[PDB]
Structure formats: structure tokens, C-alpha cells
Structure 1
Amino acid sequence: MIVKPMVRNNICLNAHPQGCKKGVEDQIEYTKKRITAEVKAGAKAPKNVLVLGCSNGYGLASRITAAFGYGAATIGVSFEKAGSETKYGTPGWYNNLAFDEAAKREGLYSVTIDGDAFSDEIKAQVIEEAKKKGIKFDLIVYSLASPVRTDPDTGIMHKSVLKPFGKTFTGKTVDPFTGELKEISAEPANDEEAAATVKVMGGEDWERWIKQLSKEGLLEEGCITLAYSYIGPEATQALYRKGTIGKAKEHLEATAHRLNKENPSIRAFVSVNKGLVTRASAVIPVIPLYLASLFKVMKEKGNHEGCIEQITRLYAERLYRKDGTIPVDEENRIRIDDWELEEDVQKAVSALMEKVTGENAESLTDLAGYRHDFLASNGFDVEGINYEAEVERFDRI
């Protein structure tokens, strides 16, 4: 049948198999052009990489950059739903298929483990595969993105929330598909939601991954491990700084800190990345309007980045530099949101957000870019795909 996007409750339910494939291929093509012999010259390189949350976003870009930019062997872990002949798989499933197929063609070692990365079973499968091939990891990318986590020690499921503390957080927002400006709110959270959010979005599982791998002797001396995060603009501080998200990030930072203390042979960092369209963006106040404005400003300035641009820059200009350093802020965090949080960028975005109305939104902001990023995450609206051609089956390509 002809596959078109199906969005319900601000979520794209289905996925285009060929579109997802093309999306992966485009990132690979960029990486080959971005990470050249000259960029790599005189710098170290990853060899054995573990990527947790490898099927989309920053995780996918991290695996692609490591594999197709540096030639590294990668083990990827993600929790997908398989396609089947008549029903849809998750976009990450098709992405993983595209990646492994491309990696095989290049002659690269690539193994994808599908399952709950929060579980000890999945960790066991990783350790087993690593033991089998004599692999010691020198780079571990933690990019897990889930609203829920089942505690491996208790079996209790925890649900994260995106809410402030004390007062209700209210701000403008925009529907990129209709162009309508709205006013939405996030109610203040309780102690349970706060603890649960830290349980899900903090650094517990990350540290658990590291400690288990270290115990099995699967970490190379000086192994780099990163957990991706976000700080955001002043307008959203009520959530990302002082909200439930803010507490989770604080736990993430304290975790990277504790990791370095107990493993003198390791290099752990929180990597603060730029803002991007995510599954949860739609329900967050301010965020969609900010991002649409941010995309507009940064594309005009020439410093706009997507996932693959962000991560290739991360590898080339932070992790593997010719000077052998790893630049961090005053809190020992890697910052690649540095272009986003430039004063000239933030002032332009702030001025832009104040001028946005229902009549000028499509013209004043990059609603087009927002729609593309939202759709491309599921394989829709990507260049070079017919879309008027029908998909024969959904368990392939």
C-alpha cells in the first residue's frame, strides 16, 4: 500500500522503510565527506565502540560516525519492534537494518542487539558477544531515550515526566503543520514524579553498564564514555534547569563524576548537545517555537546542525583532536551546544520569538525545517523517495 505519514496525538505512528534507509545512507554519505583523511590526520581514532540507543537521533549518528568515519567496529543496542509482512516496525528497526547492511557492504564488523538496554539480559548478550570476538571497548556512547524504565533489581516500572517544580510553567508554542500559535502549560510535579524521572533519565543505568563491563574486563585503558544531555535556552530553564528534567541531568552529571573517581583508567563525560525535534517536543511549552526560531536563525547564520553534523563535530573536534585534548566547560562537561547558546544566536532567537504571530509564523520561523525533521525521523519527506510508489512489505529494506 501507499505509505503516508499517520500522526496521532503529536506522534507519527508508522514509518517508511525505504525512507528510513535513505535517511541512514544520507548520514553515511555526509560522514564520509566530513571525516576525511585530513580531518583524521594526526589524531587518535575509535576502534571498538558500544552505542546504547543506536537506532535513532544522536545514537544513530554516533554509530555511523564511528563506523563510516573512523572504520570502527560497533555493537549497537536498541529496543525496537520488528516489522513483519503486513504491519509496521519502529523506524529504528529499519534504521538498524539499513546500518548493518551498509556496514556489511563496507566490510565492517557490526552487531545489533535488540532488546531492553535497561535489562541485565541485554547487558549479558553484549558481554557475551564482546567476549566472543575478543573486543575491549574504547568508546561507549550512552544515548538511551525512553519515557519508561524497569528497575533491574526490583522489577518496578518507572515513568518520567517533563514538568517544573513549585509553579505551573506556561509558554507559547506552535503547531508546525497548521502554523497555529498556542498557549500550553506544564503543571508542577510531585516527589514521586521527580524521583521516577531521575530513575529513568538519570545516570543509574549508564553506571550499571560501565560497572558490569569493567568487571568483565571489557574496557580498554582510557576508555571514553559519554551520556548525551541538554541545557537549553533561558526560556525553558523552568524544566531543563530546575524541573524534573533538570534533576535528572544533575544526576547524570554526578554520575559521570563518580565514574571518573572509581575508575582512574576511564574518561567519563556528559555531552551537552544542541536542541532538536524529539518525540516529546510537542507537549513541552516553548520548545517547538524556540526550535523553529532556532533553526531559522542558525540556518541564516550558517551554524545550523542536525544529528550527523553535531556528532561528526563531536568526534573530530572534541573526542579525537590533533592536540589530544578533550575541551570541557568549567563543570567538566563536553559542550557542542556552544553554537546554539552563542549570545548572538540567543539574542536573535529571543527577538524572533517575540515577533511571531499566526500570520507570519511560516515566514518568520523554519516551520518547514521542523516538519522535515519530525517526518524524516520516521522516513517521511526525505529526498529521493517516490512516496507515491507503494510499499510491498514491511519486514525488509
Structure 2
Amino acid sequence: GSHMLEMIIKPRVRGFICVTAHPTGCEANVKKQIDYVTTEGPIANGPKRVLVIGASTGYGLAARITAAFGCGADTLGVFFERPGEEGKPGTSGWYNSAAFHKFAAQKGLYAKSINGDAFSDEIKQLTIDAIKQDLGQVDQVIYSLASPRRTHPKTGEVFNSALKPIGNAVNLRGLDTDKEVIKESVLQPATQSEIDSTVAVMGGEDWQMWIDALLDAGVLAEGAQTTAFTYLGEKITHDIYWNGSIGAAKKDLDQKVLAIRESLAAHGGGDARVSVLKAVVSQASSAIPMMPLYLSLLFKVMKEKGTHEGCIEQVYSLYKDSLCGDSPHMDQEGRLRADYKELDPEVQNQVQQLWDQVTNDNIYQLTDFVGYKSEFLNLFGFGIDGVDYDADVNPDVKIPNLIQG
């Protein structure tokens, strides 16, 4: 009666939230990303020992897969996910990470993971301990956390991030993905306390605390390199993103990367860069006002140009061109740029024109909302080819070498 312990798992979506995840589908999604990387080919001169903070979904998962299956790296991942249990599917990041460990072992690559709050001292200590035991040191640290809150590791204060404009309220158009309607709403500007809290969570302090802690522990190698992911976006997103409260946080990253680069470049010519990536569908981005509509438009325009990319394609090129290659593709600030295809003037102009014309009636003629919906479901392991969604599956999937914080 093994079906008592198993279930048929279907999507249960509410706005930008899906409360279920499919273990087999997440495994298939991970395999697809791995197969992309191995199909593209290896990346020369990559790091061989990598710490990825935020390693279970989205860009961080893509970085772990790229490092491991592209650069041949041993990888230590840190993330914050819910394991499955009977009757209750775990989070997609849990199942993604289970799959990553399975495939890494098949290839003879080291994979160990730590599940817990990355903002906490405990998790940093557990991470230091794992590196010491296993790897000696790491050559690269990827900082790829997206979180709505942070408990300060010293004072215990809980900071909450806000996704609001700064200065003036803004009329933002968007797509209500449940009702499938184009709708506007007015978002009020952030208070100073809200801006400060957002910087506390998504700014660069914790990144700094990580690098310093690893440094003080002697677990970073000569020539070590670290990067945190950021988003600048097209001008149309500037009100809510770059010049909003979240932008105040990402701008803080810029006030961190200098000190970090300074510490590493003395340590064997190591380096640090904020890396700027394109918008993609993710658990994080889907929750940002305007983003489902913007993404649906951007996908259409970029597909027409042959330049559309998801997480894995974006990060593979970041490693190949910029982190390990001869094309930092530097901007005037010293950031690594991998987002130029989204920011091309002809792309921005086309997105802007469509933005002004889209209505309930022409959604499927003017946008790639179909593609948006598909990629969103894929995040949670749904709609993946070759997966039998009618078969019972055990939601309790275990991960070897998983340290629970």
C-alpha cells in the first residue's frame, strides 16, 4: 500500500505563488539545465571549489550547475528550503537540490549543501566547517540571495524589504495573471524606514559579512573571486526597480563591491564584481510589481530577435565570457555586464511601444504571456516534457550530505 505515502501533485497557483512543487519535474528541470551546459561545452579556467549562497533555485542554481558541469567544480550550496513530507510537497528548491546532488554524484563531482538562514552566524560557521573538512578552501563565492526579510545576526532585529517607488507614487501597469487582465495600480512611495529596511535585506552588508567571515577563517584561496547578482533593467522598470527601494539596496551592493575587491586583489590578484543579469521568471521576480507584464513583453521581443535566454543560458555566458573569460564586459562603475541584450535600444523601444498598446483583448497577439506562464510552471516542476504527471510520487525526497541548520 505504498500509495498511502504517495500522491498525485498538481499545480496550485495563486497570483505569483504556487504552493506545490513536483519532485520528478524539478529533477527533470535540473537535468535540462545540466544538459544545456554539457551540450554547450566546458568552460576553461573556471574555479574548482565554489560556494554558492542561494544555490537551490533561479540564478544561484544556474551558477551551481554552471560551475559544476561547465567548470568541473566541487560545489557547496547554501539555501533555505522546506523538505517534503507525506501529504505535503516540499519547495521546488528542495527538489532541485536533491536532483543536483544525484546528478553531481553520477558525474563524480562533490556536492554538499547547507539548509538554513544564510543571514545567521550559525550558518556561516557551519559553512566554514564544511569547507575546512572537505575542500580546504574555496576559489569562488557566488552571492545570489533573494529574500523578503533578514534577521540581523547581532541585534536580532527583523528587517523587511519593500518593493516600492521612492519620492513620488507611481501608476504601474501590470498583468493580473489569475484574471488575465491588464490593470494599473498606484504604488505609494517608500518611507525612509522602509528604504533602510530594504537596504538591510538586499543590500551588501551580509555579502560583506560572508566574505569577511570566510577570510578570517582562512578558507578563501589565492586569486579567489566573488560576485553578487544585480539587475539594472530597461528604463521602463526604473520607477519600481532601479530608482525604487529595491534599487536603493542594489545600489548598496555598489558600496560594498569596492571594499571586497580591495581585500581579494591583495590576496593573489583575486577579484570581486557585481554582475548585472537580465530579467527572468523566478520566484523572486514574479513577485515584483509590473514584472509579469514586462517579462511577457520582453520575451516576445527577444524571441523575435533570437536572443531570449533563461537562467542557465544567462549564467553560462556570464561564466564563460566574464567570470572566467577575457570579457569582463565592464561598465563605467566596474560592474560585469551580461544584460546588454535586454537593454539594447531597439529592444527597449519595441517593449515600450507594446507596453502602451496591450489590452485584455490583444494579450496573446502582443505578448508572450503563454511563454511566461510555461516558464513560471516550470519553476515548480510542472509542464516538463517526459514527466508523467498522472503517476503517484513520494513527496519525501531525501538529500545526502545535507546539513540542516
Give the Cα separation in 2 of the matches to 1:309 and 1:282: 19
1:369 maps to a residue whose letter is G
Q: Any idea what SS the aligned residue of 1:340 has? A: helix
Cα-to-partner distance string for 1:25-82 (whole Å, 9 max, x where unaligned): 000000101134xxx4xx4121000000000000000000110111110000001111
Correspondences of 1:255-294 after superposition (within 5 Å) = 255-263=256-264, 264-265=266-267, 266-282=270-286, 284-294=288-298
Partner of 2:3: none
Partner of 1:344: 346
Per the alignment, do residues 219 and 283 of structure 1 end up closer, same or farther by CA in structure 2, a change over 3 Å counting? closer
Per the alignment, do residues 134 and 370 of structure 1 end up closer, same or farther by CA in structure 2, a change over 3 Å counting? closer
Per the alignment, do residues 10 and 241 of structure 1 end up closer, same or farther by CA in structure 2, a change over 3 Å counting? closer
Match of 2:41 among 35, 39, 46: 35
1:296 maps to a residue whose letter is K
Cα-to-partner distance string for 1:223-257 (whole Å, 9 max, x where unaligned): 11010010111112112222111110111111011
How far did residue 283 of structure 1 move? 5.1
Match of 1:7 among 2, 13, 18: 13
Correspondences of 1:114-133 after superposition (within 5 Å) = 114-133=115-134
Return 5+ residue gaps in structure 1 as ranges: none
How far did residue 258 of structure 1 move? 1.6
1:376 maps to a residue whose letter is N
TM-score (norm 2): 0.93
**Counterpart contact for 1:170–1:285, Cα < 8 Å:** no
**Counterpart contact for 2:240–2:289, Cα < 8 Å:** no
Cα-to-partner distance string for 1:137-189 (whole Å, 9 max, x where unaligned): 11110001110111001111111000012211212111345431111232111
2:383 maps to a residue whose letter is D
Aligned positions, number: 390
Give the Cα separation in 2 of the matches to 1:276 and 1:157: 28
Cα-to-partner distance string for 1:110-136 (whole Å, 9 max, x where unaligned): 101111111111111111111112422
Give the Cα separation in 2 of the matches to 1:227 and 1:168: 29
Please say which of residues 210-219 and 234-243 is displaced more in the overlay: 234-243
Give the Cα separation in 2 of the matches to 1:127 and 1:194: 32
Give the Cα separation in 1 of the matches to 2:382 and 2:144: 23
TM-score (norm 1): 0.94
Q: Any idea what SS the aligned residue of 2:207 has? A: helix
Give the Cα separation in 2 of the matches to 1:328 and 1:178: 42
Q: Any idea what SS the aligned residue of 1:77 has? A: strand
Partner of 1:305: 309
**Counterpart contact for 2:98–2:397, Cα < 8 Å:** no
Q: CA RMSD in A?
A: 1.6
Partner of 2:189: 188
1:314 maps to a residue whose letter is L
Per the alignment, do residues 280 and 170 of structure 1 end up closer, same or farther by CA in structure 2, a change over 3 Å counting? farther
Partner of 1:138: 139
Give the Cα separation in 2 of the matches to 1:254 and 1:35: 35
Cα-to-partner distance string for 1:299-344 (whole Å, 9 max, x where unaligned): 11001100000000011111112x4x53311100011111100111
Partner of 1:153: 154
Q: Any idea what SS the aligned residue of 1:382 has? A: coil
1:170 maps to a residue whose letter is N
2:390 maps to a residue whose letter is E
Partner of 2:402: none
Partner of 1:67: 68
Give the Cα separation in 1 of the matches to 2:184 and 2:203: 29
**Counterpart contact for 2:80–2:116, Cα < 8 Å:** yes
Q: Any idea what SS the aligned residue of 2:218 has? A: coil
Cα-to-partner distance string for 1:260-294 (whole Å, 9 max, x where unaligned): 23443231111111011233545544322211110
Please say which of residues 360-369 and 130-139 is displaced more in the overlay: 130-139
Give the Cα separation in 2 of the matches to 1:121 and 1:270: 26
**Counterpart contact for 1:235–1:286, Cα < 8 Å:** no
Give the Cα separation in 2 of the matches to 1:88 and 1:350: 40
> What's the % identity of the aligned pairs?
47
Q: Any idea what SS the aligned residue of 1:245 has? A: helix
State whether structure 2 residue 82 is matched by structure 1 residue 76: no
Give the Cα separation in 1 of the matches to 2:123 and 2:62: 22
2:324 maps to a residue whose letter is Y
Give the Cα separation in 2 of the matches to 1:68 and 1:241: 33
